Amino acid sequence: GSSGSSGAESLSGLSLKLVKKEPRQLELTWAGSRPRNPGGNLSYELHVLNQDEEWHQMVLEPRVLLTKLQPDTTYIVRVRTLTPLGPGPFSPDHEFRTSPPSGPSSG
Numbered sequence: 001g002s003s004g005s006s007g008a009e010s011l012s013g014l015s016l017k018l019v020k021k022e023p024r025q026l027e028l029t030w031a032g033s034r035p036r037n038p039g040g041n042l043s044y045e046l047h048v049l050n051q052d053e054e055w056h057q058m059v060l061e062p063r064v065l066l067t068k069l070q071p072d073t074t075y076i077v078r079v080r081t082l083t084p085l086g087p088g089p090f091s092p093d094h095e096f097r098t099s100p101p102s103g104p105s106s107g
Helices: none
Strands: 018-022 025-029 041-049 054-059 062-065 074-082 094-097
Touching: 018 094, 025 074, 025 094, 062 074
Parallel strands: none
Antiparallel strands: 018 025, 025 062, 041 054, 041 074, 074 094
């Protein structure tokens, strides 16, 4: 990663990733921490946004399972690690697309 111009926000290793692509489901996972961590089970704030539907849900795990979603729809997700003194920033809008509805398949 080259700092160079803007963009380098020294993210705390929170780059949402598409775990599974489903028409009515979407899983994501963000990992990138170091071992030998002290007590105080940290947390993570999840915030999902849609075309005309915005919802958030704080999760205590680096994983998240979203259900009851619409097929062929772009769902934005952003997770940020919570802290007692200065909480991490909100990850960059991750453009994600759900699995397509019943359709044909090239031979």
